[PDB]
Amino acid sequence: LPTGVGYDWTGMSYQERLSGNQAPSLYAISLIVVFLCLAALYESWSIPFS
Amino acid sequence: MPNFFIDRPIFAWVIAIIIMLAGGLAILKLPVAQYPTIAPPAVTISASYP
Amino acid sequence: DLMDKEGKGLIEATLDAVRMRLRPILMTSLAFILGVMPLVISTGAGSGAQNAVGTGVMGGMVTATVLAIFFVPVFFVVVRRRFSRKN
Amino acid sequence: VFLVMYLFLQNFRATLIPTIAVPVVLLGTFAVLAAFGFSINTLTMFGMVLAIGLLVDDAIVVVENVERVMAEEGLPPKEATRKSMGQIQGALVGIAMVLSAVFVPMAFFGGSTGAIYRQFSITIVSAMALSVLVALILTPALCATMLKPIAKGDHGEGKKGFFGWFNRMFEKSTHHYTDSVGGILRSTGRYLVLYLIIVV
């Protein structure tokens, strides 16, 4: 492309252009909150990890 | 009744961590501006004509 | 805590409560004034507020903490020992 | 605040318990205004640095009262913090109740400056409220678990030198202060009237 040229990805490419998946951040902190909530239900250190 | 949750001390740890990541989510979520907008609303309708 | 759980005379329960209270007053006092050292050394950056108000609550400490260590028990015993009940 | 926290009772174990308890409180502050969405702001940030002065010395009144109550009779700390949480479940609902009472006027202002007072108000709402709550539950657990079962009625007969010598200065000023209770009961006479002149 020459100079002074831009472009855009939109549609559902606007949605994925924002973010395709911030989901694995939520699987990460989901694993966190599952880990600690089971650390209350177990009420035990690392016994939940099973 | 507090001692019941002394008996699950890891539960109180979990509460502290919920504070740590609710608060971490907050400080990575909260917008920044030094002056939480104080002045009354003042619409300034203006014009110009030579 | 030392009124009817410990049903003694007011003065000796006051003394135990003010010894057991006495070490908190020192540790809180020095603790907080070292808390407000940065507020008072500050130049610029809200300097009126941390300097003036830091010194203001500092004077709150020294004119409260080492003031009314004497006053709170004797106010208690003039409220009670002038105006308890007859029993 | 942390160097203050290590400083006093000269323990590389005990005084280290409440320290990590400290910042969790203030970051929970943000969570409280996450209930409010109130953006981080220099007025609010200054009100919360004054307020973190307020919850750190709330932190040391609760943990010093706990450390005392477990310290003077030296039983295994269960029943120590049971009685302790008796008197300061009463005192914690005390300080929360009256402290809430001292800055509900800051909530009920008018004016735009008064809305800034509302920002400091909600700041110390957060500080007061969640500070009392973590003192209620988290603090007796942390003190209850990872401390040592110490000897009963122990004053520190082996702790010597400048440190226990300063504790002898401490009891010197303690009994000196007992003499101040008697003689300044006579000066609740003359420091009653001196109290009137200083208050005017």
Curated annotation (Swiss-Prot), chain D:
Transmembrane intervals: 16-35, 42-63, 89-107, 116-140, 189-200
Induction: Positively regulated by MarA, Rob and SoxS transcriptional regulators (at protein level).
Subcellular location: Cell inner membrane
Cytoplasmic-side segments: 7-15, 64-88, 141-188
Ranges in the topological domain labelled Periplasmic: 36-41, 108-115
Coiled-coil regions listed in the entry: none
Phenotype when the gene is knocked out: Loss of susceptibility to contact-dependent growth inhibition (CDI); inhibiting cells still contact the target.
Family stated for the protein in its record: Belongs to the resistance-nodulation-cell division (RND) (TC 2.A.6) family.
Purpose of the protein: AcrA-AcrB-AcrZ-TolC is a drug efflux protein complex with broad substrate specificity that uses the proton motive force to export substrates. (Microbial infection) Involved in contact-dependent growth inhibition (CDI), acts downstream of BamA, the receptor for CDI. Its role in CDI is independent of the AcrA-AcrB-TolC efflux pump complex.
Assembly notes: Homotrimer, with large domains that extend into the periplasm, interacts with AcrA and TolC. AcrA may be required to stably link this protein and TolC. Interacts with AcrZ. Part of the AcrA-AcrB-AcrZ-TolC efflux pump.
Protein name per its UniProtKB record: Multidrug efflux pump subunit AcrB
Organism this protein belongs to: Escherichia coli (strain K12)
